[PDB]
Design a protein around this ligand. Structure first.
Ligand SMILES: Nc1nc2c(ncn2[C@@H]2O[C@H](COP(=O)(O)O)[C@@H](O)[C@H]2O)c(=O)[nH]1
Ligand SMILES: [Mg+2]
Ligand SMILES: [Mg+2]
Ligand SMILES: [Mg+2]
Lengths: 59, 275, 166, 140, 148, 83, 94
């Protein structure tokens, strides 16, 4: 690691902006992958108390 | 009134307990408080931390010059600890520098000594000594004792320990206790620095390599109020360090800090101190 | 009953040194067994708390209420009290800090309802307490700006950490 | 009166002492706290099994997440682990993914290789050289 | 109760594990009496085991008041100064021996709920996880749907 | 040449067994970010303020309102720090 | 909409529960191992008149041990030691 405390904690719980193209896709499957990415379940450090969610953009 | 006094007794214990919490008295020395024997305590204390030597050297270390002023003052109305503290802190500085430079030859004499000055500082030494009951044995004029006076008494114990046991046992003492407090805090927590990338380019010229360039590798939330950049420092198209940060400047200086740790060998994933 | 509020004036702090912060002299005063409901003048106590006395004299004496006449006569009699025998330089450069009210020794009577039933009527007496402190009054804490909102939230995101883990 | 309890004051205070943090008239009065203090204690007991189930299922979501990042799913993952004889519970398996994803990548790479070995075994059960990692240790 | 009681992260007093171990019990102050039937356990404990307890632990210091007391007490303070008193009223010698032994074993920090059952000073090796650990980069460093 | 996962984003991974076949070893040095995969470096009131910072932080307006003194006093002032 | 008469699990009309392949796979596993059982407890080792009087010794001596355990029922033994140790509550120093 060799990272400082506050910068390392910031990068871990930071948010990220996903992008998705909805051309010829069903609203459910894009919703299924999106919803898990909204709580931050994809993050191995997930916890419901910590709002570690990430943004999602659909087109 | 209903009969009985047992309930009224324990209630007075509850009243004085609340009166204690409401208006507590100021603290005092443990010698003032009951159940105290002076000679037996330093003896029992010496056996606690596994040290055995003459009481003349012990009492001379715990005694300060300030208490002698009040002692003779109250007498009208013996030996200080300056020499012991002098030799104590002298050997500690040389010994701490010895083990640190042997483990980290890459660290310069400037930064390695500032760390030794920190571990031998007031807040660190007094915290170790406060949690080793040196405050109860030390005697001064004012209570709570100052940190500088308590610091002098601590090294005075190191001096008396040096004269009796030897350097090897004194080395084992200061090595074990102080370094364990160093395990927690990383370099730039106690040893703060200015212009890290400037110091980085200075160090890299000593190591005979080119001037690196800062380049953002990854980005997120740039226009957002939570910017995030992964800045990496490359020289000759080869990377050394990568550092996150809020802005490009915070990520740049952080990446400069990341290189300084591994350059001096103070990485978080380095070999812990053997015993 | 209890009358500690009068004993609060009897304390005596030790002498202060030359090179130390000038202490603001406090002083207490109250009135006992007034004919006015506890919750009523508590509104008046909520008004005056956090302003200056002479500015407070203006508000209540224009306030069309009975309690104001009762809690103004306690104010300026605490004003001239504080200067005559408590060493207050300015009768105006001071600020009230604690103004509250409380129940008193009430009195119960009977009100005659219809069909023979009776209703217990409680007459209300109260005790009004006021504390004065010299020096100018403190300014009101303004509403927290967007910078305070932002920094508090970033501090929350910086202070949080992983849980149920190594 | 000849016999009267004198320490009624204390046996209720210990109840209210635990119930100070309650809201409303519960922390002040006694009987309101008696209804809630035992109920709060009862919920504390069986909440352990909820703590077990919640934290257990939480580790499943974590390991399921790190596996999907590397291109696998949790049910196939642990199947390869126990097949390859590594008894790492869900705590360390999750916690390993937190601090060393390089290690968890090796666990996933170890797991994915066992799947191809298992599918190769699905084609031919015997009559072939067994998988190198699918080989087992025999204790006796 | 966890929420009503305070809590803490697990930690030791000045890292007593690596270096030389030190018995973190500083002092024991027994309060017994020449009378009172409840003091039979403490006095017989003073006769037999308190002697051997001192021989076993030269570091710890012991004091005995031996004053009139309706209830015997035993007070124990540690290096940090955390005082902890327990009642030995009407207790057997065997229970008191185990009680004084565990007092010698434990450290000077208040027994409360622990936030977690361990503590790691350097938990991170190979770099702690951030979102960009397990995904690749882009040629020329380009975001999705970007020309230049 | 066959690989179980693409070794181009996290680390170059390769597994290995001792010849007896009782222990498994791994070698995973981290990837080096190429130079090509980089870039060069270069008042108001309650209503308007609570919504604009909500649009700025991408969150709701509820948490920004002030809480009561009941919760402000229950907040711990000396929380424990780990590591 | 979609209610049902009375209780959900009794009466002339209740909620019609249906089967899943999970429960099917579960119960066939229980009776197929029972078919493995049905094979094993067949082909006995000994005959009826072979195993007639082989264990009567153990069942007799075992029951006699229960008889001795039942007869062995009395109050415990009293002593002057445990009686006079109560006197030691007033042991006090000189
Ligand atoms: N209404 C009310 N006033 C109180 C209470 N405790 C104290 N006070 C007021 O504060 C004064 C000083 O009390 P002490 O400083 O606690 C009292 O004389 C009384 O006027 C309480 O519980 N309720
Ligand atoms: Mg009524
Ligand atoms: Mg389970
Ligand atoms: Mg129904």
């Amino acid at each position: 690691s060799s990272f400082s405390r506050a910068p390392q904690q910031w990068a871990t719980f930071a948010r990220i902006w996903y992008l998705l193209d909805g051309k010829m896709q069903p609203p459910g499957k894009l919703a299924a992958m999106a919803s898990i990415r909204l709580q931050g379940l994809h993050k191995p450090v997930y916890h419901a108390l910590s709002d570690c969610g990430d943004h999602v953009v659909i087109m | 009134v209903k009969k009985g006094f047992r309930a009224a007794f324990r209630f007075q214990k509850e009243l004085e307990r609340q009166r204690l919490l409401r208006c507590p008295p100021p603290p005092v020395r443990r010698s003032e408080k009951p159940n105290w024997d002076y000679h037996a305590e330093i003896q029992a204390f010496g056996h606690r931390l596994q040290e055995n030597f003459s009481l003349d050297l012990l009492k001379t270390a715990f005694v300060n010059s300030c208490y002698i002023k009040s002692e003779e003052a109250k007498r009208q109305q013996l030996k200080s600890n300056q020499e012991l503290s002098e030799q104590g802190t002298s050997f500690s500085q040389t010994c701490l520098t010895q083990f640190l430079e042997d483990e980290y030859p890459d660290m310069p004499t400037e930064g390695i000594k500032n760390l030794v000055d920190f571990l031998t500082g007031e807040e660190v030494v007094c915290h170790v000594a406060r949690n080793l009951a040196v405050e109860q044995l030390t005697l001064s004029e004012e209570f709570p004792v100052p940190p500088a006076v308590l610091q002098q008494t601590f090294f005075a114990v190191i001096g008396a320990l040096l004269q009796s046991s030897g350097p090897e046992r004194t080395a084992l003492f200061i090595r074990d206790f102080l370094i364990t407090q160093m395990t927690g805090k990383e370099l730039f927590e106690m040893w703060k620095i200015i212009n890290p990338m400037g110091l980085l380019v200075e160090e890299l010229k000593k190591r005979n390599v080119s001037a690196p360039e800062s380049r953002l590798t990854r980005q997120s939330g740039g226009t957002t109020a939570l910017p995030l950049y992964f800045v990496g420092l490359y020289c000759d198209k080869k990377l050394i360090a990568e550092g996150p940060g809020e802005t490009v400047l915070v990520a740049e200086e952080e990446a400069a800090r990341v290189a300084l740790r591994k350059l001096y060998g103070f990485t978080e994933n380095r070999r812990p101190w053997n015993y | 009953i209890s009358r500690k509020w009068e004993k609060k004036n009897k304390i005596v702090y030790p002498p202060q040194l030359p090179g130390e912060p000038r202490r603001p002299a406090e002083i207490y005063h109250c009135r006992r067994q007034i004919k006015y409901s506890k919750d009523k003048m508590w509104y008046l106590a909520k008004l005056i708390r956090g302003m200056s006395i002479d500015q407070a004299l203006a508000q209540l004496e224009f306030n069309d209420k009975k309690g104001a006449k009762i809690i103004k006569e306690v104010l300026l009699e605490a004003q001239d009290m504080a200067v005559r025998d408590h060493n207050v330089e300015f009768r105006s450069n001071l600020y009230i800090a604690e103004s509250t009210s409380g129940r008193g020794q009430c009195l119960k009577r009977i009100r005659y309802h219809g069909r023979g039933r009776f209703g217990i009527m409680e007459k209300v007496y109260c005790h009004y307490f006021v504390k004065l402190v010299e020096g100018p009054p403190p300014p009101p804490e303004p509403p927290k700006t967007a910078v305070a909102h932002a920094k508090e939230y970033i501090q929350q995101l910086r202070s949080r950490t992983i849980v149920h883990t190594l | 009166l000849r016999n009267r309890v004198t320490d009624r004051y204390f046996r209720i205070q210990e109840v209210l002492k635990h119930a100070r943090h309650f809201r409303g008239r519960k922390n002040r009065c006694y009987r309101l706290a008696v209804r809630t203090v035992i109920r709060a204690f009862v919920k504390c007991t069986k909440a352990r099994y909820l703590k077990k189930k919640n934290m257990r299922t939480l580790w499943i979501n974590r390991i399921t997440a790190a596996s999907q990042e590397h291109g696998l799913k949790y049910p196939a993952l642990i199947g390869n682990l126990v097949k390859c004889q590594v008894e790492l519970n869900r705590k360390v398996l999750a916690d390993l993914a937190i601090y060393e994803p390089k290690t968890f990548k090796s666990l996933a790479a170890l797991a994915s290789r066992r799947r191809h070995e298992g599918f190769a075994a699905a084609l031919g059960d015997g009559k072939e050289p067994e998988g190198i990692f699918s080989r087992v240790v025999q204790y006796h | 109760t966890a929420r009503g009681t305070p809590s803490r992260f697990l930690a030791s007093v000045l890292h007593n594990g690596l270096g030389r171990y030190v018995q973190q019990l500083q002092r024991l102050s027994f309060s017994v009496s020449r009378d009172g039937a409840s003091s039979r356990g403490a006095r017989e404990f003073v006769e037999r085991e308190v002697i051997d307890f001192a021989r076993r632990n030269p570091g710890v210091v012991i004091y005995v008041n031996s004053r009139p007391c309706c209830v015997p007490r035993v007070v124990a303070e540690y290096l940090n100064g955390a005082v902890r008193e327990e009642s030995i009223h009407c207790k057997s010698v065997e229970e008191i021996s185990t009680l004084v032994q565990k007092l010698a074993d434990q450290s000077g920090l208040d027994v409360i709920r622990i936030r977690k059952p361990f503590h790691t000073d350097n938990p991170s090796i190979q770099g702690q996880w951030h979102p960009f650990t397990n995904k690749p980069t882009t040629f020329r460093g380009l975001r999705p749907r970007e020309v230049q | 040449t066959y690989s179980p996962l693409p070794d181009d984003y996290n680390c170059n991974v390769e597994l290995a067994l001792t010849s007896d076949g009782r222990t498994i070893v791994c070698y995973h040095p981290s990837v080096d970010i190429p130079y090509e995969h980089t870039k060069p470096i270069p008042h108001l009131e309650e209503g308007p303020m609570i919504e604009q910072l909500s649009k700025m932080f991408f969150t709701t307006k509820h948490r920004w309102y002030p809480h009561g003194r009941y919760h402000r006093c229950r907040k711990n002032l000396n929380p424990p720090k780990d590591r | 909409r979609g209610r049902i008469p009375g209780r959900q699990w009794i009466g002339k009309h209740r909620r019609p529960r249906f089967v899943s392949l999970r429960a099917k796979q579960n119960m066939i596993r229980r009776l197929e191992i029972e078919a493995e059982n049905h094979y094993w407890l067949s082909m006995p080792y000994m005959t009826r008149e072979q195993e007639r009087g082989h264990a009567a010794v153990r069942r007799r001596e075992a029951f006699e041990a229960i008889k001795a355990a039942a007869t062995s029922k009395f109050p415990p033994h009293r002593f002057i030691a445990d009686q006079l140790d109560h006197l030691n509550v007033t042991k006090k120093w000189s």
